[PDB]
Amino acid sequence: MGTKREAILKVLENLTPEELKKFKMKLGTVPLREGFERIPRGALGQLDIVDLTDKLVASYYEDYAAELVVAVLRDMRMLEEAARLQRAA
């Protein structure tokens, strides 16, 4: 079913190889809440947009992930796109 996991991947898949790479790293830039931390090192250049999404969604949950994912795209000068993510509800 995964609607956010679907909306998420539908967008992460549009991230060009350069954005995909940055996406992984730029995830370890946005500050995280207390019990939350950065994305494990070996989890960056190992997980594909699928597992990278699962790891993101699984680690941050579909709800906060989307929030985390959104702000990242926004950082990559993708304000309008991330907006489409916010509609994934």
mmCIF file of N, CA, C and O in Angstrom:
data_model
loop_
_atom_site.group_PDB
_atom_site.id
_atom_site.type_symbol
_atom_site.label_atom_id
_atom_site.label_comp_id
_atom_site.label_asym_id
_atom_site.label_seq_id
_atom_site.Cartn_x
_atom_site.Cartn_y
_atom_site.Cartn_z
ATOM 1 N N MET A 1 0.863 -1.215 0.000
ATOM 2 C CA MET A 1 0.000 0.000 0.000
ATOM 3 C C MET A 1 0.883 1.244 0.000
ATOM 4 O O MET A 1 0.873 2.013 -0.961
ATOM 5 N N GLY A 2 1.644 1.414 1.088
ATOM 6 C CA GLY A 2 2.562 2.550 1.259
ATOM 7 C C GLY A 2 2.255 3.710 0.312
ATOM 8 O O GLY A 2 2.619 3.676 -0.862
ATOM 9 N N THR A 3 1.589 4.741 0.830
ATOM 10 C CA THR A 3 1.252 5.911 0.018
ATOM 11 C C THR A 3 2.382 6.928 0.064
ATOM 12 O O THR A 3 2.727 7.532 -0.951
ATOM 13 N N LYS A 4 2.978 7.089 1.240
ATOM 14 C CA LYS A 4 4.095 8.011 1.381
ATOM 15 C C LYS A 4 5.332 7.344 0.805
ATOM 16 O O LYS A 4 6.095 7.956 0.057
ATOM 17 N N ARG A 5 5.495 6.063 1.127
ATOM 18 C CA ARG A 5 6.609 5.295 0.601
ATOM 19 C C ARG A 5 6.537 5.316 -0.918
ATOM 20 O O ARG A 5 7.559 5.248 -1.601
ATOM 21 N N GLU A 6 5.314 5.433 -1.440
ATOM 22 C CA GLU A 6 5.108 5.487 -2.878
ATOM 23 C C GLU A 6 5.424 6.889 -3.387
ATOM 24 O O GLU A 6 6.181 7.058 -4.341
ATOM 25 N N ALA A 7 4.850 7.890 -2.731
ATOM 26 C CA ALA A 7 5.084 9.272 -3.120
ATOM 27 C C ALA A 7 6.553 9.616 -2.946
ATOM 28 O O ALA A 7 7.128 10.353 -3.747
ATOM 29 N N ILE A 8 7.157 9.075 -1.897
ATOM 30 C CA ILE A 8 8.553 9.326 -1.630
ATOM 31 C C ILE A 8 9.401 8.787 -2.783
ATOM 32 O O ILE A 8 10.064 9.552 -3.480
ATOM 33 N N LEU A 9 9.364 7.477 -2.993
ATOM 34 C CA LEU A 9 10.135 6.863 -4.071
ATOM 35 C C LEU A 9 9.812 7.486 -5.431
ATOM 36 O O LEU A 9 10.707 7.684 -6.250
ATOM 37 N N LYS A 10 8.545 7.792 -5.675
ATOM 38 C CA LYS A 10 8.175 8.385 -6.954
ATOM 39 C C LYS A 10 9.001 9.651 -7.178
ATOM 40 O O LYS A 10 9.268 10.038 -8.316
ATOM 41 N N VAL A 11 9.390 10.295 -6.082
ATOM 42 C CA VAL A 11 10.175 11.526 -6.158
ATOM 43 C C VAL A 11 11.683 11.264 -6.086
ATOM 44 O O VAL A 11 12.469 11.862 -6.834
ATOM 45 N N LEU A 12 12.093 10.376 -5.186
ATOM 46 C CA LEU A 12 13.512 10.089 -5.052
ATOM 47 C C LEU A 12 14.055 9.525 -6.348
ATOM 48 O O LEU A 12 15.235 9.681 -6.668
ATOM 49 N N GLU A 13 13.185 8.867 -7.089
ATOM 50 C CA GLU A 13 13.574 8.272 -8.357
ATOM 51 C C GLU A 13 13.849 9.347 -9.415
ATOM 52 O O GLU A 13 14.531 9.083 -10.403
ATOM 53 N N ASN A 14 13.319 10.556 -9.212
ATOM 54 C CA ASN A 14 13.533 11.640 -10.175
ATOM 55 C C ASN A 14 14.814 12.370 -9.847
ATOM 56 O O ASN A 14 15.312 13.167 -10.642
ATOM 57 N N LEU A 15 15.376 12.055 -8.694
ATOM 58 C CA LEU A 15 16.639 12.653 -8.307
ATOM 59 C C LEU A 15 17.748 12.067 -9.170
ATOM 60 O O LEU A 15 17.995 10.862 -9.149
ATOM 61 N N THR A 16 18.387 12.924 -9.948
ATOM 62 C CA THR A 16 19.447 12.478 -10.848
ATOM 63 C C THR A 16 20.654 11.958 -10.053
ATOM 64 O O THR A 16 20.895 12.392 -8.925
ATOM 65 N N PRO A 17 21.400 11.026 -10.609
ATOM 66 C CA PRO A 17 22.587 10.416 -9.944
ATOM 67 C C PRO A 17 23.340 11.367 -9.013
ATOM 68 O O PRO A 17 23.820 10.951 -7.958
ATOM 69 N N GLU A 18 23.443 12.638 -9.389
ATOM 70 C CA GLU A 18 24.139 13.610 -8.550
ATOM 71 C C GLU A 18 23.302 13.969 -7.333
ATOM 72 O O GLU A 18 23.835 14.181 -6.245
ATOM 73 N N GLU A 19 21.991 14.033 -7.519
ATOM 74 C CA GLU A 19 21.097 14.367 -6.421
ATOM 75 C C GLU A 19 20.918 13.163 -5.516
ATOM 76 O O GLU A 19 20.793 13.302 -4.301
ATOM 77 N N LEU A 20 20.946 11.976 -6.110
ATOM 78 C CA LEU A 20 20.818 10.756 -5.330
ATOM 79 C C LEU A 20 21.982 10.692 -4.356
ATOM 80 O O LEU A 20 21.809 10.413 -3.171
ATOM 81 N N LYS A 21 23.173 10.951 -4.875
ATOM 82 C CA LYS A 21 24.367 10.921 -4.052
ATOM 83 C C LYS A 21 24.258 11.964 -2.942
ATOM 84 O O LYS A 21 24.453 11.656 -1.768
ATOM 85 N N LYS A 22 23.937 13.193 -3.321
ATOM 86 C CA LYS A 22 23.800 14.268 -2.348
ATOM 87 C C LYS A 22 22.672 13.953 -1.372
ATOM 88 O O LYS A 22 22.796 14.185 -0.171
ATOM 89 N N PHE A 23 21.579 13.405 -1.894
ATOM 90 C CA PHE A 23 20.444 13.043 -1.048
ATOM 91 C C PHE A 23 20.920 12.232 0.156
ATOM 92 O O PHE A 23 20.590 12.540 1.302
ATOM 93 N N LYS A 24 21.692 11.188 -0.124
ATOM 94 C CA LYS A 24 22.214 10.314 0.924
ATOM 95 C C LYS A 24 23.006 11.101 1.968
ATOM 96 O O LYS A 24 22.798 10.942 3.170
ATOM 97 N N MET A 25 23.934 11.924 1.496
ATOM 98 C CA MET A 25 24.781 12.710 2.385
ATOM 99 C C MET A 25 24.026 13.867 3.018
ATOM 100 O O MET A 25 24.179 14.135 4.209
ATOM 101 N N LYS A 26 23.234 14.581 2.222
ATOM 102 C CA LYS A 26 22.509 15.726 2.747
ATOM 103 C C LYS A 26 21.525 15.295 3.818
ATOM 104 O O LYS A 26 21.002 16.130 4.552
ATOM 105 N N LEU A 27 21.303 13.994 3.956
ATOM 106 C CA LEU A 27 20.415 13.522 5.010
ATOM 107 C C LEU A 27 21.139 13.631 6.352
ATOM 108 O O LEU A 27 20.515 13.762 7.405
ATOM 109 N N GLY A 28 22.469 13.575 6.289
ATOM 110 C CA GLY A 28 23.307 13.666 7.484
ATOM 111 C C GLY A 28 23.744 15.106 7.737
ATOM 112 O O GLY A 28 24.816 15.353 8.288
ATOM 113 N N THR A 29 22.896 16.051 7.339
ATOM 114 C CA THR A 29 23.179 17.477 7.530
ATOM 115 C C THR A 29 22.047 18.116 8.324
ATOM 116 O O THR A 29 22.279 18.875 9.264
ATOM 117 N N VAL A 30 20.820 17.788 7.937
ATOM 118 C CA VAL A 30 19.645 18.316 8.616
ATOM 119 C C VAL A 30 19.604 17.842 10.076
ATOM 120 O O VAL A 30 19.463 16.646 10.318
ATOM 121 N N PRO A 31 19.702 18.721 11.051
ATOM 122 C CA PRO A 31 19.643 18.311 12.488
ATOM 123 C C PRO A 31 18.483 17.347 12.759
ATOM 124 O O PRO A 31 17.420 17.462 12.145
ATOM 125 N N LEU A 32 18.683 16.405 13.690
ATOM 126 C CA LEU A 32 17.635 15.433 14.043
ATOM 127 C C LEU A 32 17.224 15.607 15.504
ATOM 128 O O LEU A 32 18.003 16.076 16.334
ATOM 129 N N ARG A 33 15.988 15.222 15.800
ATOM 130 C CA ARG A 33 15.464 15.332 17.153
ATOM 131 C C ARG A 33 16.217 14.406 18.108
ATOM 132 O O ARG A 33 16.970 13.530 17.682
ATOM 133 N N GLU A 34 16.020 14.633 19.401
ATOM 134 C CA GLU A 34 16.687 13.852 20.446
ATOM 135 C C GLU A 34 16.928 12.394 20.041
ATOM 136 O O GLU A 34 17.943 12.070 19.426
ATOM 137 N N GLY A 35 16.005 11.518 20.436
ATOM 138 C CA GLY A 35 16.130 10.084 20.164
ATOM 139 C C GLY A 35 16.423 9.762 18.698
ATOM 140 O O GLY A 35 16.523 8.590 18.331
ATOM 141 N N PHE A 36 16.565 10.784 17.860
ATOM 142 C CA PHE A 36 16.852 10.578 16.436
ATOM 143 C C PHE A 36 18.256 11.056 16.115
ATOM 144 O O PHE A 36 18.762 11.993 16.732
ATOM 145 N N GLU A 37 18.893 10.381 15.163
ATOM 146 C CA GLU A 37 20.259 10.711 14.778
ATOM 147 C C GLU A 37 20.433 10.675 13.266
ATOM 148 O O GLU A 37 19.486 10.456 12.511
ATOM 149 N N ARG A 38 21.666 10.903 12.854
ATOM 150 C CA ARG A 38 22.024 10.915 11.439
ATOM 151 C C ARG A 38 21.904 9.514 10.831
ATOM 152 O O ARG A 38 21.701 8.531 11.541
ATOM 153 N N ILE A 39 22.031 9.444 9.505
ATOM 154 C CA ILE A 39 21.935 8.174 8.793
ATOM 155 C C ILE A 39 23.273 7.413 8.893
ATOM 156 O O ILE A 39 24.305 7.932 8.467
ATOM 157 N N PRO A 40 23.290 6.201 9.416
ATOM 158 C CA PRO A 40 24.547 5.406 9.519
ATOM 159 C C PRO A 40 25.422 5.560 8.273
ATOM 160 O O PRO A 40 24.916 5.727 7.164
ATOM 161 N N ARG A 41 26.733 5.531 8.473
ATOM 162 C CA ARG A 41 27.678 5.692 7.372
ATOM 163 C C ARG A 41 27.473 4.640 6.277
ATOM 164 O O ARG A 41 27.173 4.976 5.132
ATOM 165 N N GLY A 42 27.670 3.374 6.630
ATOM 166 C CA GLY A 42 27.540 2.282 5.664
ATOM 167 C C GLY A 42 26.148 2.210 5.034
ATOM 168 O O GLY A 42 25.939 1.463 4.078
ATOM 169 N N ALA A 43 25.199 2.972 5.565
ATOM 170 C CA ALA A 43 23.835 2.964 5.030
ATOM 171 C C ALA A 43 23.681 3.933 3.860
ATOM 172 O O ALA A 43 22.648 3.960 3.198
ATOM 173 N N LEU A 44 24.687 4.758 3.626
ATOM 174 C CA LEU A 44 24.601 5.746 2.552
ATOM 175 C C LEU A 44 24.872 5.144 1.167
ATOM 176 O O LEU A 44 23.981 5.098 0.319
ATOM 177 N N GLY A 45 26.111 4.718 0.937
ATOM 178 C CA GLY A 45 26.500 4.162 -0.365
ATOM 179 C C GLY A 45 26.256 2.658 -0.459
ATOM 180 O O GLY A 45 26.993 1.951 -1.149
ATOM 181 N N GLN A 46 25.221 2.169 0.222
ATOM 182 C CA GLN A 46 24.891 0.736 0.188
ATOM 183 C C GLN A 46 23.431 0.504 -0.201
ATOM 184 O O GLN A 46 23.118 -0.386 -0.992
ATOM 185 N N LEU A 47 22.546 1.299 0.386
ATOM 186 C CA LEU A 47 21.110 1.183 0.141
ATOM 187 C C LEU A 47 20.665 1.901 -1.139
ATOM 188 O O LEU A 47 21.048 3.047 -1.379
ATOM 189 N N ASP A 48 19.818 1.240 -1.933
ATOM 190 C CA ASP A 48 19.287 1.852 -3.153
ATOM 191 C C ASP A 48 18.099 2.730 -2.770
ATOM 192 O O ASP A 48 17.672 2.696 -1.620
ATOM 193 N N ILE A 49 17.556 3.512 -3.706
ATOM 194 C CA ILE A 49 16.418 4.377 -3.371
ATOM 195 C C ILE A 49 15.333 3.576 -2.651
ATOM 196 O O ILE A 49 14.551 4.135 -1.888
ATOM 197 N N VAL A 50 15.295 2.268 -2.884
ATOM 198 C CA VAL A 50 14.300 1.427 -2.229
ATOM 199 C C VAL A 50 14.676 1.207 -0.772
ATOM 200 O O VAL A 50 13.942 1.593 0.138
ATOM 201 N N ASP A 51 15.830 0.588 -0.559
ATOM 202 C CA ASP A 51 16.303 0.323 0.790
ATOM 203 C C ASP A 51 16.667 1.627 1.498
ATOM 204 O O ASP A 51 16.503 1.750 2.713
ATOM 205 N N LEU A 52 17.118 2.612 0.726
ATOM 206 C CA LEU A 52 17.452 3.920 1.280
ATOM 207 C C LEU A 52 16.165 4.561 1.782
ATOM 208 O O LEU A 52 16.134 5.206 2.828
ATOM 209 N N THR A 53 15.086 4.313 1.047
ATOM 210 C CA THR A 53 13.779 4.814 1.438
ATOM 211 C C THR A 53 13.288 4.027 2.647
ATOM 212 O O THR A 53 12.835 4.601 3.637
ATOM 213 N N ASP A 54 13.396 2.704 2.557
ATOM 214 C CA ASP A 54 12.971 1.845 3.652
ATOM 215 C C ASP A 54 13.732 2.203 4.920
ATOM 216 O O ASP A 54 13.145 2.323 5.988
ATOM 217 N N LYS A 55 15.041 2.383 4.793
ATOM 218 C CA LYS A 55 15.870 2.735 5.941
ATOM 219 C C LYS A 55 15.438 4.088 6.493
ATOM 220 O O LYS A 55 15.392 4.293 7.706
ATOM 221 N N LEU A 56 15.109 5.003 5.591
ATOM 222 C CA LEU A 56 14.665 6.331 5.991
ATOM 223 C C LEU A 56 13.289 6.231 6.625
ATOM 224 O O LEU A 56 13.062 6.688 7.746
ATOM 225 N N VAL A 57 12.378 5.630 5.878
ATOM 226 C CA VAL A 57 11.011 5.453 6.324
ATOM 227 C C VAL A 57 10.962 4.556 7.557
ATOM 228 O O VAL A 57 10.211 4.817 8.491
ATOM 229 N N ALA A 58 11.762 3.496 7.552
ATOM 230 C CA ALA A 58 11.780 2.573 8.688
ATOM 231 C C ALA A 58 12.399 3.219 9.923
ATOM 232 O O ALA A 58 11.951 2.984 11.046
ATOM 233 N N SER A 59 13.451 4.001 9.716
ATOM 234 C CA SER A 59 14.152 4.642 10.823
ATOM 235 C C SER A 59 13.440 5.897 11.326
ATOM 236 O O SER A 59 13.464 6.184 12.522
ATOM 237 N N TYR A 60 12.843 6.668 10.415
ATOM 238 C CA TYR A 60 12.172 7.917 10.795
ATOM 239 C C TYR A 60 10.653 7.810 10.683
ATOM 240 O O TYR A 60 9.941 8.746 11.019
ATOM 241 N N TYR A 61 10.155 6.681 10.200
ATOM 242 C CA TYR A 61 8.710 6.505 10.042
ATOM 243 C C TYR A 61 8.236 7.250 8.795
ATOM 244 O O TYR A 61 8.836 8.243 8.387
ATOM 245 N N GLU A 62 7.158 6.761 8.206
ATOM 246 C CA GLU A 62 6.596 7.372 7.005
ATOM 247 C C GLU A 62 6.242 8.848 7.208
ATOM 248 O O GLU A 62 6.333 9.649 6.278
ATOM 249 N N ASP A 63 5.779 9.185 8.407
ATOM 250 C CA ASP A 63 5.339 10.549 8.707
ATOM 251 C C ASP A 63 6.481 11.546 8.884
ATOM 252 O O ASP A 63 6.482 12.605 8.253
ATOM 253 N N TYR A 64 7.449 11.226 9.737
ATOM 254 C CA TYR A 64 8.561 12.147 9.950
ATOM 255 C C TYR A 64 9.539 12.039 8.801
ATOM 256 O O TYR A 64 10.203 13.012 8.448
ATOM 257 N N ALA A 65 9.617 10.864 8.195
ATOM 258 C CA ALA A 65 10.515 10.712 7.065
ATOM 259 C C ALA A 65 10.141 11.732 6.001
ATOM 260 O O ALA A 65 10.946 12.583 5.626
ATOM 261 N N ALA A 66 8.900 11.650 5.527
ATOM 262 C CA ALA A 66 8.418 12.584 4.515
ATOM 263 C C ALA A 66 8.818 14.007 4.894
ATOM 264 O O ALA A 66 9.262 14.784 4.048
ATOM 265 N N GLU A 67 8.682 14.332 6.179
ATOM 266 C CA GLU A 67 9.064 15.656 6.656
ATOM 267 C C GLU A 67 10.569 15.834 6.470
ATOM 268 O O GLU A 67 11.034 16.880 6.016
ATOM 269 N N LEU A 68 11.323 14.787 6.807
ATOM 270 C CA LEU A 68 12.777 14.816 6.658
ATOM 271 C C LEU A 68 13.131 14.873 5.180
ATOM 272 O O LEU A 68 13.947 15.688 4.754
ATOM 273 N N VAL A 69 12.502 14.010 4.399
ATOM 274 C CA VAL A 69 12.753 13.973 2.968
ATOM 275 C C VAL A 69 12.458 15.332 2.341
ATOM 276 O O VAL A 69 13.269 15.866 1.590
ATOM 277 N N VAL A 70 11.284 15.874 2.642
ATOM 278 C CA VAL A 70 10.877 17.156 2.085
ATOM 279 C C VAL A 70 11.969 18.205 2.272
ATOM 280 O O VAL A 70 12.477 18.748 1.291
ATOM 281 N N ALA A 71 12.308 18.527 3.514
ATOM 282 C CA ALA A 71 13.312 19.556 3.777
ATOM 283 C C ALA A 71 14.620 19.319 3.025
ATOM 284 O O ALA A 71 15.318 20.275 2.685
ATOM 285 N N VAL A 72 14.965 18.064 2.763
ATOM 286 C CA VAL A 72 16.207 17.784 2.052
ATOM 287 C C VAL A 72 16.095 18.256 0.610
ATOM 288 O O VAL A 72 16.943 19.006 0.126
ATOM 289 N N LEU A 73 15.035 17.834 -0.071
ATOM 290 C CA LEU A 73 14.831 18.253 -1.450
ATOM 291 C C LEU A 73 14.830 19.774 -1.521
ATOM 292 O O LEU A 73 15.448 20.367 -2.405
ATOM 293 N N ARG A 74 14.149 20.403 -0.571
ATOM 294 C CA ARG A 74 14.087 21.857 -0.528
ATOM 295 C C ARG A 74 15.496 22.439 -0.524
ATOM 296 O O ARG A 74 15.757 23.467 -1.150
ATOM 297 N N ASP A 75 16.396 21.777 0.194
ATOM 298 C CA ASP A 75 17.778 22.232 0.287
ATOM 299 C C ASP A 75 18.472 22.142 -1.071
ATOM 300 O O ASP A 75 19.355 22.943 -1.380
ATOM 301 N N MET A 76 18.068 21.163 -1.878
ATOM 302 C CA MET A 76 18.662 20.977 -3.202
ATOM 303 C C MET A 76 17.981 21.872 -4.236
ATOM 304 O O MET A 76 17.932 21.539 -5.419
ATOM 305 N N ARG A 77 17.464 23.009 -3.775
ATOM 306 C CA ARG A 77 16.784 23.966 -4.651
ATOM 307 C C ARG A 77 15.567 23.329 -5.330
ATOM 308 O O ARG A 77 15.233 23.662 -6.467
ATOM 309 N N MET A 78 14.892 22.432 -4.612
ATOM 310 C CA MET A 78 13.687 21.769 -5.127
ATOM 311 C C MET A 78 12.517 22.092 -4.203
ATOM 312 O O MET A 78 11.983 21.220 -3.518
ATOM 313 N N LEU A 79 12.148 23.370 -4.178
ATOM 314 C CA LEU A 79 11.066 23.845 -3.324
ATOM 315 C C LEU A 79 9.694 23.364 -3.805
ATOM 316 O O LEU A 79 8.895 22.862 -3.016
ATOM 317 N N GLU A 80 9.418 23.540 -5.093
ATOM 318 C CA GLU A 80 8.128 23.141 -5.651
ATOM 319 C C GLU A 80 7.900 21.634 -5.539
ATOM 320 O O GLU A 80 6.815 21.190 -5.171
ATOM 321 N N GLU A 81 8.917 20.852 -5.867
ATOM 322 C CA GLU A 81 8.798 19.399 -5.807
ATOM 323 C C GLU A 81 8.448 18.925 -4.400
ATOM 324 O O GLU A 81 7.451 18.231 -4.201
ATOM 325 N N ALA A 82 9.271 19.297 -3.427
ATOM 326 C CA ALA A 82 9.026 18.892 -2.047
ATOM 327 C C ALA A 82 7.600 19.266 -1.645
ATOM 328 O O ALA A 82 7.000 18.636 -0.776
ATOM 329 N N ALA A 83 7.060 20.295 -2.287
ATOM 330 C CA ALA A 83 5.703 20.727 -1.990
ATOM 331 C C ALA A 83 4.724 19.619 -2.355
ATOM 332 O O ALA A 83 3.743 19.384 -1.646
ATOM 333 N N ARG A 84 5.005 18.929 -3.457
ATOM 334 C CA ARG A 84 4.150 17.837 -3.897
ATOM 335 C C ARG A 84 4.179 16.721 -2.863
ATOM 336 O O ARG A 84 3.210 15.975 -2.711
ATOM 337 N N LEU A 85 5.290 16.621 -2.136
ATOM 338 C CA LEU A 85 5.417 15.603 -1.103
ATOM 339 C C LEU A 85 4.467 15.935 0.047
ATOM 340 O O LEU A 85 3.771 15.060 0.564
ATOM 341 N N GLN A 86 4.448 17.204 0.445
ATOM 342 C CA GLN A 86 3.589 17.644 1.536
ATOM 343 C C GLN A 86 2.126 17.325 1.241
ATOM 344 O O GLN A 86 1.293 17.307 2.146
ATOM 345 N N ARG A 87 1.819 17.067 -0.029
ATOM 346 C CA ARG A 87 0.450 16.746 -0.428
ATOM 347 C C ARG A 87 0.204 15.244 -0.302
ATOM 348 O O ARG A 87 -0.912 14.769 -0.511
ATOM 349 N N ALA A 88 1.253 14.505 0.043
ATOM 350 C CA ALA A 88 1.141 13.060 0.197
ATOM 351 C C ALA A 88 0.389 12.716 1.478
ATOM 352 O O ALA A 88 0.831 11.879 2.264
ATOM 353 N N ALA A 89 -0.751 13.371 1.682
ATOM 354 C CA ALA A 89 -1.564 13.131 2.872
ATOM 355 C C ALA A 89 -3.027 13.462 2.596
ATOM 356 O O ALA A 89 -3.692 13.922 3.509
#
